[PDB]
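[stage:ingest] chain + small molecule (bromide ion)
[stage:ingest] validated
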Amino acid sequence: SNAVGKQSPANPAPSRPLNDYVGVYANDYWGPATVTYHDGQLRLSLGPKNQTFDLTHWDGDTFTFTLSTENALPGSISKATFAGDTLNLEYYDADKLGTFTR
Ligand SMILES: [Br-]
Ligand SMILES: [Br-]
Ligand SMILES: [Br-]
Ligand SMILES: [Br-]
Ligand SMILES: [Br-]
Ligand SMILES: [Br-]
Ligand SMILES: [Br-]
Ligand SMILES: [Br-]
Ligand SMILES: [Br-]
Ligand SMILES: [Br-]
Ligand SMILES: [Br-]
Ligand SMILES: [Br-]
Ligand SMILES: [Br-]
Ligand SMILES: [Br-]
Ligand SMILES: [Br-]
Ligand SMILES: [Br-]
Ligand code: NI
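[stage:predict] done
[stage:export] tokens:
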């Protein structure tokens, strides 16, 4: 079996019911972040071509996704933090334009 490295939270707080996260979170700069639910899975869609990522629970209202093979760093883990009607995507927040609001 794979060696273990503690790179996920061991004792995370549970998520809310998954319906709570679903919606279209607006942003003028990056365009909307669309969060949808299918067969137990939250997904994040970004851009005009609907580039889509599975959201994996991390801790509390924070999820992660893994970057695509088009990225400089495919498979790197990126945080998606939900708080009320906001979604913060750390990948897009370098100039503080990474909050999306539904
Ligand atoms: Br690990
Ligand atoms: Br923990
Ligand atoms: Br703990
Ligand atoms: Br919505
Ligand atoms: Br928008
Ligand atoms: Br929109
Ligand atoms: Br799915
Ligand atoms: Br796109
Ligand atoms: Br669409
Ligand atoms: Br994915
Ligand atoms: Br999960
Ligand atoms: Br979950
Ligand atoms: Br959180
Ligand atoms: Br990507
Ligand atoms: Br990583
Ligand atoms: Br990132
Ligand atoms: Ni082993």
